[PDB]
């Protein structure tokens, strides 16, 4: 899945059973951008 580095904030594709590290930084914490499946919000 596509992740985001917590330092440079750039897209980096990480596959399964792959080391978690940013190529541009070596930063060891990655985040997930968002899901394409939208949800329904009601103003309540």
């Amino acid at each position: 899945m596509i992740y985001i580095c917590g330092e440079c904030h750039t897209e980096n594709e990480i596959k399964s059973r792959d080391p978690i590290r940013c190529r541009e930084c070596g930063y060891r914490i990655m985040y997930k951008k968002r899901t394409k499946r939208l949800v329904v919000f009601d103003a309540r």
Binding site: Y3, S16, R17, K32, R37
Partner: protein, 343 residues
């Protein structure tokens, strides 16, 4: 720190000041600014943390003004419909719909896949019904190809949010479901490596709690009062100018399990809002006095003691007793009905 934020503590009873110290800590609000980046097991953040109308000078040093943990409320002290006992309070349904006391809730779920045993190890992947022998009845479409639910997916009830399996000597499902049945949306997902070097991830599930009849609200001093009943703006007792009180508390609390500072704070709040100046809450400042506050209020076309004529919402006839209404600071306590029932 907790006692300094109390106006007129000298006017307040000693147990009440001690009681507030416990309640103040339990109050929910913006604890820090970098809450989004961090991951905490429990973190309640208020929608509209507003600095109080009545603030103490020492409050500046505590920085509580920057990060308050409550919202002001125009509180009319009256017995309306008898739905509030000594330990209770009546809210305004319309006000809550506008964001009167709403707050967010964050629960962080944390898991790691470690090779504890040579033969058996943990992995992150989708627990397919075929490859997995033992599993629990739940919806697994939420998980992605990597076994982690992406941010922005609504989760309700019993649902798997992280996929983990053990290759026992065929694999057995050992995923983690939601702690409670609350409906929440995942905010952010974090994947890392623990100190041992194994893959480790954290995800923060965000849920929105709307104040209801079961939530416990507590003033800055006195005993916490549960929201006995919620009434729409029409049903609330409106004054001559059309100001339906946001909250109604039981007058019978004031005598013993409450303090006159609540009435004084209401008087100061009315003057502060009317005059557009933040009142001084120094415990031992001779400049601030009840008589002085009353005189200031009278200059703005208001009763010197803060009493006002409230028209009952149901029947338009004037109430015989003139209610006392003022903008008293209030805070929402962590104790909520949704957490207890959802458990």
């Amino acid at each position: 720190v907790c006692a300094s934020i109390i106006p007129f503590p000298d006017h307040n009873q000693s147990p009440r000041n001690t009681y507030q110290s416990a309640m103040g800590k339990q109050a929910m609000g913006v604890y820090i600014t970098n809450f989004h980046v961090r991951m905490d097991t429990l973190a309640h953040v208020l929608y509209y943390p507003q600095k109080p109308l009545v603030t103490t000078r020492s409050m500046e040093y505590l920085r509580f003004r920057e990060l308050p943990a409550g919202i002001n409320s125009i509180v009319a002290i009256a017995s309306y419909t008898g739905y509030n006992q000594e330990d209770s309070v009546i809210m305004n349904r319309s006000a809550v719909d506008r964001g009167f006391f709403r707050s967010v809730f964050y629960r962080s779920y944390k898991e790691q896949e470690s090779k504890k045993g040579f033969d058996q190890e943990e992995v992150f992947e989708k627990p397919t019904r075929e490859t997995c022998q033992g599993m629990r009845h739940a919806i697994y479409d939420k998980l992605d190809d990597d076994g982690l639910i992406a941010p922005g997916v609504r989760v309700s009830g019993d649902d798997v949010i992280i996929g983990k399996t053990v290759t026992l000597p065929t694999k057995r499902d050992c995923s983690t479901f939601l702690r409670t049945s609350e409906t929440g949306i995942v905010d952010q997902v974090m994947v890392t490596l623990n100190q041992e070097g194994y893959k480790f991830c954290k995800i923060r599930v965000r849920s929105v709690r709307i104040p209801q009849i079961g939530d416990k609200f507590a003033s800055r001093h006195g005993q916490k009062g549960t929201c006995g009943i919620q009434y729409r703006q029409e049903d609330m007792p409106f004054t001559c100018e059309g100001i339906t009180p946001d909250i109604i508390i039981n007058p019978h609390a004031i005598p013993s399990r409450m303090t006159i500072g609540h009435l004084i704070e209401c008087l100061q709040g009315k003057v502060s809002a009317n005059k557009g100046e933040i009142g001084d809450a120094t415990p031992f400042n001779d400049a601030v006095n009840v008589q002085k506050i009353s005189n200031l209020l009278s200059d703005y076309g208001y009763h010197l003691r803060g009493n006002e004529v409230l028209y009952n919402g149901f029947t338009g006839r004037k109430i015989t007793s003139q209610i006392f209404i003022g903008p008293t600071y209030y805070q929402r306590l962590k104790h909520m009905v949704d957490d207890k029932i959802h458990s």
